[PDB]
Amino acid sequence: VYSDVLALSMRPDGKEVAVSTLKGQISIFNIEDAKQVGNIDCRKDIISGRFNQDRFTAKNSERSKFFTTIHYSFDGMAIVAGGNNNSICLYDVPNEVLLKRFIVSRNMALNGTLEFLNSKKMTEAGSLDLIDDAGENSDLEDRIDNSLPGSQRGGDLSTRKMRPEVRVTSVQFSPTANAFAAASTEGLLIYSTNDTILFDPFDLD
Amino acid sequence: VRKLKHHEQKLLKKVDFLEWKQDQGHRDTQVMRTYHIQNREDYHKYNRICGDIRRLANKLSLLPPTDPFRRKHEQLLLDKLYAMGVLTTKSKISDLENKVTVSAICRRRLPVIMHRLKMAETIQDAVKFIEQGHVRVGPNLINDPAYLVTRNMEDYVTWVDNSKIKKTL
């Protein structure tokens, strides 16, 4: 391949392979032969977020426009991929165009959620939120700062000295009902096709 | 403040407003100068751990010499501090109090690393490039200029793709 691959994923037939380069472009490779089958693009249709401490806009941010996990469907005809973005993607394999794009979480305290930041928070020098507000807590323990400066996905939450990035690490399909689950920063999310399990009381007094 | 007189000087024997002993010679700032850290408290974020190295390095020097825990735990300290590259050598034990500076952990900072590799001309231009979002450490583009990068992560810093400054070189 010509660019930096990661997060490999095979078809269950084992004759085609989904690859995620640094460009975001997923490629599909033959295994019985050597050439590339076709490649689907993800650097355009990825919802990425601009952090409050970001100094570049999300349209030309290279934060999260690749995929940290790829999975084939149980026909091998669809693929759900997920990265360090707010966006989870469902590409069709032979028709080669994404079917649906999914938010994992819509949270202001999660960092890369928002596409566009609100300009009322961009003050004279600095963000309005990047000011250390832990020093005004009534409690001593919450006023105590233990944050080592440049910790990225380290041990504890308080020691980033940052908001948590919206990132989704691991992606898998269910065999049966095509349900896909992805363990996010928030936790394990479940999408499914088990529709109308939404419980519906009827004729309530 | 005044180039004060011969008669003023002897009466104001101990006073100063610029260099204090609690202000410890403004030594920290000379490291805040040479490595261009944004906040002041990054220095004391290294120097609060830096004594904590020595505070373990001192009392592991107080154990009996061929205590088989002592030579093992010191090796576990030194391989760790050698993976992060905050000391040049690992053969001697004496770097754990002599080489552990704020400048030594602060020359394992990210723009120092790019400033060594001469992708940037000066230090602050690399900080400006991290702020512009031009750099990445293997997988991830990093926005933060204050990245602690280990010795083994040092090969993973490239320019980020499709940029205007990677095409500049």
């Binding site: - | 403004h26 700032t29 100068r33």
Partner: peptide, 25 residues
């Protein structure tokens, strides 16, 4: 429109003339 690397400008030991070690020249 703020410049990048907004750093804490603080006391220069090699440039501040208020220092008596730099009171000479």
């Amino acid at each position: 429109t703020r410049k990048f690397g907004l750093v804490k400008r603080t006391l220069n030991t090699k440039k501040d003339q208020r220092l008596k070690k730099n009171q000479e020249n």
